[PDB]
PDB file of C-alpha atoms and ligand atoms in Angstrom:
ATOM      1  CA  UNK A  13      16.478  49.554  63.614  1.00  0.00           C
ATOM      2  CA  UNK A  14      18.669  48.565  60.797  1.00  0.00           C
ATOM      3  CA  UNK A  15      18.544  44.983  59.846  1.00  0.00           C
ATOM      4  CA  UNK A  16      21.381  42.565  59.131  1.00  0.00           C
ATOM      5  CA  UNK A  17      23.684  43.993  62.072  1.00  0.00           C
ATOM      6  CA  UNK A  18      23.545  41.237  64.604  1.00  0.00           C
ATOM      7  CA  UNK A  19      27.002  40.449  63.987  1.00  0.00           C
ATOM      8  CA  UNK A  20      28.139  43.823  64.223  1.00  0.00           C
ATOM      9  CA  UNK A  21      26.700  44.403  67.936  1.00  0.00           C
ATOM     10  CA  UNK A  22      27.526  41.078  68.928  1.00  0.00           C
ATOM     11  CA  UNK A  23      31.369  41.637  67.854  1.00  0.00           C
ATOM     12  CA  UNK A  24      30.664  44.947  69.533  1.00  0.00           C
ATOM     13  CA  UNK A  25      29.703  42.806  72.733  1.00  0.00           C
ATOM     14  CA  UNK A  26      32.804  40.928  72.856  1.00  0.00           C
ATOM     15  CA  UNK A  27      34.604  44.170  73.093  1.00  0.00           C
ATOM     16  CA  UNK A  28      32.642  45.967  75.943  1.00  0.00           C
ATOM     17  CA  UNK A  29      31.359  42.789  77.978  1.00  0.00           C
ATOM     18  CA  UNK A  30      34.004  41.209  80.311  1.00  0.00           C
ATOM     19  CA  UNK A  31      34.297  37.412  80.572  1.00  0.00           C
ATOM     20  CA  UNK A  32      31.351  36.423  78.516  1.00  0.00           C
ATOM     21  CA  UNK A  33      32.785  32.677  78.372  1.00  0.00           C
ATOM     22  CA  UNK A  34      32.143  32.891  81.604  1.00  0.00           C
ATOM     23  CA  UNK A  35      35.432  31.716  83.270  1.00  0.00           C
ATOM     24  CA  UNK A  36      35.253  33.747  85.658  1.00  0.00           C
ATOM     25  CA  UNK A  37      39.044  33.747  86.055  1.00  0.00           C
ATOM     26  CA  UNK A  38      39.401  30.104  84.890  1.00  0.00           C
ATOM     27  CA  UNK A  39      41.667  30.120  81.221  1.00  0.00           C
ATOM     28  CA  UNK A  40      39.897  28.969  77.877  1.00  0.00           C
ATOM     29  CA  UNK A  41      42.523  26.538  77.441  1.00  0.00           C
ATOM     30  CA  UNK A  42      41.754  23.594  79.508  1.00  0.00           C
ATOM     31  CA  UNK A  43      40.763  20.242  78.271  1.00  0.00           C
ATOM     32  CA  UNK A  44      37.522  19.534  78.992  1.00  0.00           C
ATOM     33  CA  UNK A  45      35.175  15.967  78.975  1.00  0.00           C
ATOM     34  CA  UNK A  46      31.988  15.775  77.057  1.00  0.00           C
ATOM     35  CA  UNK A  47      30.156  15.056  80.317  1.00  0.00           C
ATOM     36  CA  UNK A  48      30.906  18.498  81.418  1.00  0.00           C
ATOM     37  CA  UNK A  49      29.673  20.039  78.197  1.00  0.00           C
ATOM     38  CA  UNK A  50      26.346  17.549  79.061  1.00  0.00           C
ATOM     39  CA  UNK A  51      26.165  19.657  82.284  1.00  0.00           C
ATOM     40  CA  UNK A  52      26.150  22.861  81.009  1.00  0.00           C
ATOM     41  CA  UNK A  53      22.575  22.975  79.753  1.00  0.00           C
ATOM     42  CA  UNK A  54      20.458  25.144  82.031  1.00  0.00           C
ATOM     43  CA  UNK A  55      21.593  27.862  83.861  1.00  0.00           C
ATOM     44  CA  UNK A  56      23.991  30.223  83.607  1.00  0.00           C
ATOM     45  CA  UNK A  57      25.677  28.882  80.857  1.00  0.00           C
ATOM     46  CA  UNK A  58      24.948  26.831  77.771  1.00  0.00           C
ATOM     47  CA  UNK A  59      27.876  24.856  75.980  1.00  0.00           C
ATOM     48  CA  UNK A  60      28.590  22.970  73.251  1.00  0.00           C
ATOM     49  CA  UNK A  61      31.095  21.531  71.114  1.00  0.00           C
ATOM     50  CA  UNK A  62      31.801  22.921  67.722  1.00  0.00           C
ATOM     51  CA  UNK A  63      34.730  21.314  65.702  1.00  0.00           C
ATOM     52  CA  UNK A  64      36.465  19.951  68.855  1.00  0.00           C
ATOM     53  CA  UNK A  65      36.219  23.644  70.612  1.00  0.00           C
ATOM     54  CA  UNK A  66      34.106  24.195  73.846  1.00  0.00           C
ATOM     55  CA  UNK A  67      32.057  27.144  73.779  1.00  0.00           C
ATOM     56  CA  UNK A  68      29.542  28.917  76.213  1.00  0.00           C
ATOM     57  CA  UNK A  69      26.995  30.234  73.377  1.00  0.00           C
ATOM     58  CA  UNK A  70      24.185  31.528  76.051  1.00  0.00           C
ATOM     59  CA  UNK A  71      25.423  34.911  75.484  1.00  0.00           C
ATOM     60  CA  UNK A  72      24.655  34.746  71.767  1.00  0.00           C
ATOM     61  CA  UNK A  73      21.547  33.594  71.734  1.00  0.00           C
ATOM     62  CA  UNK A  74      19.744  36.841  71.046  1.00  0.00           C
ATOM     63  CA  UNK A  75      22.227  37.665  68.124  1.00  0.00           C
ATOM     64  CA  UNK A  76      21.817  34.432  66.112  1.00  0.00           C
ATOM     65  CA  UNK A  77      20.294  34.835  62.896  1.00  0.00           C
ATOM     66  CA  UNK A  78      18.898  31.591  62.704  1.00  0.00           C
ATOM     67  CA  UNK A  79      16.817  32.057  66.021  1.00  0.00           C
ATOM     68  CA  UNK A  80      17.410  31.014  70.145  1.00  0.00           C
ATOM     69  CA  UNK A  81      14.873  28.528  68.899  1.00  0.00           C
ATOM     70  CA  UNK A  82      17.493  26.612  66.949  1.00  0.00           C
ATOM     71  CA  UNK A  83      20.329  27.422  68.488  1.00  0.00           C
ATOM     72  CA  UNK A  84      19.157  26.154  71.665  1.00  0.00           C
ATOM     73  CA  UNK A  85      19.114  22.836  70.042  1.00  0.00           C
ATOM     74  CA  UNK A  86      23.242  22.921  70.251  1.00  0.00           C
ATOM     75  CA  UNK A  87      22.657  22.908  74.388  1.00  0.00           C
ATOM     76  CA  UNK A  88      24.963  20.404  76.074  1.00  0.00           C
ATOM     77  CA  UNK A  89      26.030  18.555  73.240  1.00  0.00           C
ATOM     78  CA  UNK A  90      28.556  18.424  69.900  1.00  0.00           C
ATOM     79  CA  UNK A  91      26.726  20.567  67.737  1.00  0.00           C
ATOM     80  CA  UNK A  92      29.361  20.040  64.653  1.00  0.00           C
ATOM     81  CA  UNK A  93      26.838  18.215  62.429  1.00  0.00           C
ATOM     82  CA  UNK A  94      23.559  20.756  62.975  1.00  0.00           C
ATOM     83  CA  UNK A  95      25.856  23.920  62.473  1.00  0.00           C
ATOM     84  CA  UNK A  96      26.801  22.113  58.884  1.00  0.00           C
ATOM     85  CA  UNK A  97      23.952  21.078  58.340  1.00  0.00           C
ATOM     86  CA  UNK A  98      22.599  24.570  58.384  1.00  0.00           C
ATOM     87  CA  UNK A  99      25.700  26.594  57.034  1.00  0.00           C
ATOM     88  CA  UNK A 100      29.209  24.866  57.052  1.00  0.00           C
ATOM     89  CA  UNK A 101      30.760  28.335  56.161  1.00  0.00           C
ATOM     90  CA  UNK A 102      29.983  30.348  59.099  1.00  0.00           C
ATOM     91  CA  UNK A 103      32.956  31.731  60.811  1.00  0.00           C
ATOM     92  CA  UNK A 104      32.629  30.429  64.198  1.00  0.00           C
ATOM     93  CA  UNK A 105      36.023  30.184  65.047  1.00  0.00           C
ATOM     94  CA  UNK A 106      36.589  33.999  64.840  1.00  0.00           C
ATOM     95  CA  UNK A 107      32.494  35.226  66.168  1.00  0.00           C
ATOM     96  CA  UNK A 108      32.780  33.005  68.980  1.00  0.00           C
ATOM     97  CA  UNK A 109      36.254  33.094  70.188  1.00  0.00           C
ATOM     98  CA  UNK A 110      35.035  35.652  73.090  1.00  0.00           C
ATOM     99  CA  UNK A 111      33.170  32.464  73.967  1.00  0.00           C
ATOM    100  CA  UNK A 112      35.877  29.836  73.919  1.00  0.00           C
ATOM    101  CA  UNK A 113      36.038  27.925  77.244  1.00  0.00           C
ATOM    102  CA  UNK A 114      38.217  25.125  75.971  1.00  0.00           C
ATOM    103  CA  UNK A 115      38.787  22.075  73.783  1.00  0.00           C
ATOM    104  CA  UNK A 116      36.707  18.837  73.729  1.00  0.00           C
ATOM    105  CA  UNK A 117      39.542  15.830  74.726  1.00  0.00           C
ATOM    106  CA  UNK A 118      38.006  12.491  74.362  1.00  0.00           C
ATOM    107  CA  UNK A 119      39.976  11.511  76.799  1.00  0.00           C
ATOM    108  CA  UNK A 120      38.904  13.634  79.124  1.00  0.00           C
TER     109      UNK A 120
HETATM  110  C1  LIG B   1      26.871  27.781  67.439  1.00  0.00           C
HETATM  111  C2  LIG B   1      27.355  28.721  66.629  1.00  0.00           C
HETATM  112  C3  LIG B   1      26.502  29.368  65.517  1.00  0.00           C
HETATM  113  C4  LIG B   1      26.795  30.513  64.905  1.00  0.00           C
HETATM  114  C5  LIG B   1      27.997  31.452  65.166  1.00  0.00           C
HETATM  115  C6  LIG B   1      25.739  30.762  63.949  1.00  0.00           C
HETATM  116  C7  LIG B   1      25.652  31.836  63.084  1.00  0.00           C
HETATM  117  C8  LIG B   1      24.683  32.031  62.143  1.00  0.00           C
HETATM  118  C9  LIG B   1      24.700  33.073  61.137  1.00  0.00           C
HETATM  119  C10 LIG B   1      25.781  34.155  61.043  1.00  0.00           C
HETATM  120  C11 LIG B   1      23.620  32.942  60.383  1.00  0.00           C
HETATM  121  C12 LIG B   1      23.216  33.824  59.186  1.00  0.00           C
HETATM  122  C13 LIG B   1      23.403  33.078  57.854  1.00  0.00           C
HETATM  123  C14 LIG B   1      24.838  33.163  57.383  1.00  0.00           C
HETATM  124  O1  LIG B   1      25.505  34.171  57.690  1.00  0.00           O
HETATM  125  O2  LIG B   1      25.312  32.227  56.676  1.00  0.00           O
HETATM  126  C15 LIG B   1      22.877  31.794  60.843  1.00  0.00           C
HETATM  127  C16 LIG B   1      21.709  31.313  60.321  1.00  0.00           C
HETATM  128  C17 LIG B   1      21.058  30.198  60.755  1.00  0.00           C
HETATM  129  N1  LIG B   1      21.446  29.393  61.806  1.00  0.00           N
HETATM  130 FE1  LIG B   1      23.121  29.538  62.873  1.00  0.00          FE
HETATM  131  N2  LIG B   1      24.821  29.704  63.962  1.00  0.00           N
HETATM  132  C18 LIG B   1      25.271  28.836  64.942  1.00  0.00           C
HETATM  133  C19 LIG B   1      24.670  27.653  65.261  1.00  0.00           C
HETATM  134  C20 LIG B   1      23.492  27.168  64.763  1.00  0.00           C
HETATM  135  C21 LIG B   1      22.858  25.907  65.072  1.00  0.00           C
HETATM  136  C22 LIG B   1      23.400  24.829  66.024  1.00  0.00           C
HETATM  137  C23 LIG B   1      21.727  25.818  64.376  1.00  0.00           C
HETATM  138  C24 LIG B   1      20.677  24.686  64.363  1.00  0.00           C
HETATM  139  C25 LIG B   1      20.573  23.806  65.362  1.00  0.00           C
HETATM  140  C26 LIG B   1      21.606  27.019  63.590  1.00  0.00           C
HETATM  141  C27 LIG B   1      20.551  27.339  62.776  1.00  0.00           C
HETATM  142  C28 LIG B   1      20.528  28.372  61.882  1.00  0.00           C
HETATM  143  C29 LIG B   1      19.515  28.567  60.872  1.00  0.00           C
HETATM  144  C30 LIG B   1      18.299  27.662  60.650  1.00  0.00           C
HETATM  145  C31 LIG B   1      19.848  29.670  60.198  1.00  0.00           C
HETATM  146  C32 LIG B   1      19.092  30.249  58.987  1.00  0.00           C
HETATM  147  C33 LIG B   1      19.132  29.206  57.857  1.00  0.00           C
HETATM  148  C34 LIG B   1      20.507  28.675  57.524  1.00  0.00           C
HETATM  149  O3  LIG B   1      21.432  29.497  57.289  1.00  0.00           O
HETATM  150  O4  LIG B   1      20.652  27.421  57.431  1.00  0.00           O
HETATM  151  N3  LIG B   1      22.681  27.839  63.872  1.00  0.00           N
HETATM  152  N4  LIG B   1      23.580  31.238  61.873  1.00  0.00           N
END
């Protein structure tokens, strides 16, 4: 054990895990409603919107530093104001991007 590498094997994750957004041949580009974030709370994915970007953050939940406790509390929704709430300066863009399943249109 060797604390404060969570970050490490999860980048090391992205690298050796295929399709972790869970796509499953779909492209992370599409332009996606908030109701369909809304229905990906349960099962085998968990979204939520960060900063206008869809992501499917089940996979991180055991690496998050802050607990699957809390992060479970981003499930299905915009989770913009609890992530700055708890730290603004994380890097989400880059630890997540393995994640990315699109981008939150409002019009949508
Ligand atoms: C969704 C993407 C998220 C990522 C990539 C992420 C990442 C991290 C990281 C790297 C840390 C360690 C502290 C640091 O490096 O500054 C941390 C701590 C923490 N996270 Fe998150 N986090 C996410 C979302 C959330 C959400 C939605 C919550 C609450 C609902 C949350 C709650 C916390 C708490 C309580 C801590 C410890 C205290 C704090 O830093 O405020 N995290 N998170």
């Amino acid at each position: 054990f060797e604390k404060g590498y969570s970050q490490m094997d999860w980048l090391k994750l992205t690298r050796t895990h295929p399709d972790l957004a869970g796509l499953k041949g779909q492209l992370n580009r599409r332009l996606i409603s908030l109701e369909e974030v809304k229905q990906h709370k349960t099962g085998d994915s968990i979204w939520t919107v960060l900063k206008g970007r869809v992501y499917n953050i089940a996979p991180y939940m055991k690496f998050h530093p802050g607990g699957v406790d809390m992060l479970m509390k981003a499930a299905g929704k915009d989770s913009t104001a609890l992530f700055n709430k708890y730290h603004a300066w994380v890097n989400f863009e880059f630890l997540l991007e393995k994640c990315l399943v699109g981008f939150l249109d409002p019009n949508e």
